[PDB]
Amino acid sequence: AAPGKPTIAWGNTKFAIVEVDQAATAYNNLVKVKNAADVSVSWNLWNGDTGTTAKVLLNGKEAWSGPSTGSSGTANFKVNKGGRYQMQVALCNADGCTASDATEIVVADTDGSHLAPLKEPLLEKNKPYKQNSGKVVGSYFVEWGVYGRNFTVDKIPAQNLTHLLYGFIPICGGNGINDSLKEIEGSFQALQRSCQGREDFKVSIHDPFAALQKAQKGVTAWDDPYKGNFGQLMALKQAHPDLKILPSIGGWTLSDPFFFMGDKVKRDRFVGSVKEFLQTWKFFDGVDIAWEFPGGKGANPNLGSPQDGETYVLLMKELRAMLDQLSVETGRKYELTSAISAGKDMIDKVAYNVAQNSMDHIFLMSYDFYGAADLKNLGHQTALNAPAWKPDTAYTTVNGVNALLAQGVKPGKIVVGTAMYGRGWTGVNGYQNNIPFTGTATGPVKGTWENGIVDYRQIAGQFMSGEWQYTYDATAEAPYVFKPSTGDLITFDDARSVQAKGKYVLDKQLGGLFSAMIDADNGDILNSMNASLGNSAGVQ
Ligand SMILES: CC(=O)N[C@@H]1[C@@H](O)[C@H](O[C@@H]2O[C@H](CO)[C@@H](O[C@@H]3O[C@H](CO)[C@@H](O[C@@H]4O[C@H](CO)[C@@H](O)[C@H](O)[C@H]4NC(C)=O)[C@H](O)[C@H]3NC(C)=O)[C@H](O)[C@H]2NC(C)=O)[C@@H](CO)O[C@@H]1O
């Protein structure tokens, strides 16, 4: 007779191709990439003959075979593809094979193949759009937004984006390499801990807890190998396979290391580490370079060189070459993008007409034109055009776009920036003709989280009632609110100014729109980004 029916032993059924060390703070130790997951199964046979061969099947296909030598057995084998499997143990002899009932096992991988899709309802004022305009609709999500702001990946209105950028991936380096981080309490030290035993100029993760370990919706079980932002982003990819999720390297306070990459030894090491990063974290679809900025005038007053423009173009070329190789190895398309200054003076330090051949999208940072850092010269921080009271205004969206076009950048490359926050001043005074911008300020407006910056959500929620004046400047295409008694003045984007930008993008055949930061919107801004680019209402 055929053997008795084996009983699969109670035991761990969750395995991982990329393992995460739960007691490690250094990125080198935190993550272990393997070619395959080490899987184990045991069984008992309570009734009958134990057969002469034991097999482990995954969805009916043999993953392991060995002699059946007793009433209990154990099998260890490798599984090299992520997902969920119906595992059985079968005992065979010359008279037949007898298979156990199936037990599901989970083999995790960083493409999120083991995860249920993270398909969450739209929150706040967010309304559903189909991505059918063919235009970019992008936004940045910040790693630390999960703390005080409590804005997690499950709160991202993901169906209303083409591109989701993760800010920010740091580049390893201590004294002289990441000095800008020292301005943020504990932040430099956090990076040094993450990069312990890791070479300068390789990428890492700034806050491994937030990125990988913090319990979040859909990734709360203790033996879920990827939690935090990355785990949720993996599940998000399962829900939105066409969403481009890009890691953004740099940003204001993590940009210092770019200034050393004129040394090709360092640049090669960096590009290599990015490749490794993408091979490790498979849910990512490319890389965004947020170098602020070639030539300097970023966070660090002691960095910036005339060489930086050349370095930028070389970096983009070499990144593209690495990504092209990754693409044909994987059969995937990878994107290369960059967030850049919108100031003409800044833009002309770089030959974007050359660099564009390496890039899928240029994220034009057409915001922060004005702010609390200058209390004497006030203006619209993210306007399309100059205002009527100062038509020679240098920093406008159109001037940034025109600077790029003048170089020879193709318009389809250019993605225009919208702000999901306001900047502002307090104590504004000495202004003429009921235009507060013509006055001067005494300090920054009180901020939502940091001085001089207000979440759009709070502007809409608090500063569009009471004593607050509201004005839409139709010449600049820019709203502002003003509280005369305290001289609080806030410049921001609203649904109408975003609409003007979208129409401008369509008229000029630009690439689309993107925003910073997604956590600060109540839905109004992203709704308008979608609508104005011609995306159809409804779900796809
Ligand atoms: C287009 C352009 O070039 N605009 C610039 C403008 O950026 C300059 O102003 C600077 O802006 C950057 C953001 O772009 C500010 O940096 C952020 O600062 C905050 C506060 O420290 C950082 O948040 C903290 O991050 C840590 C992790 O390091 C978390 O642990 C904390 O929870 C978190 N704290 C809070 C309260 O959120 C954040 O990481 C920084 N972001 C980045 C990407 O670096 C910078 O402070 C700001 N500097 C000044 C002086 O305002 C502006 C300066 O004049 O010039 C242009 O307008």
Author numbering: 24 to 563
Wording from the paper:
During the processive movement on crystalline chitin surface, chitinase keeps binding with single chitin chain in the catalytic cleft and repeats chemical and mechanical steps. In the chemical step, the catalytic amino acid residue and chitin N-acetyl group first cleave the glycosidic bond without attacking water, a mechanism called as substrate-assisted catalysis. From the results of this study, we conclude that SmChiA operates as a Brownian ratchet that compensates chitobiose unit interaction from the crystal surface to its binding site.
In this mutant, the amino acid residues constructing subsite +2 to −2 and stabilising the Michaelis complex were mutated. This mutant was designed to observe less stable substrate–enzyme complexes than the Michaelis complex. We solved four different crystal structures of the mutant bound with various lengths of oligosaccharides. These crystal structures showed that the mutant can bind to the substrate at various positions. The mutated amino acid residues were not involved in the interactions between the substrate and the enzyme in the observed intermediate complexes. The conformer A was major and interacted with the reducing end of chitohexaose via a water molecule, but the protonation state was not clear. The Trp275 should be important to relieve steric hindrance at the product-binding site during sliding motion.
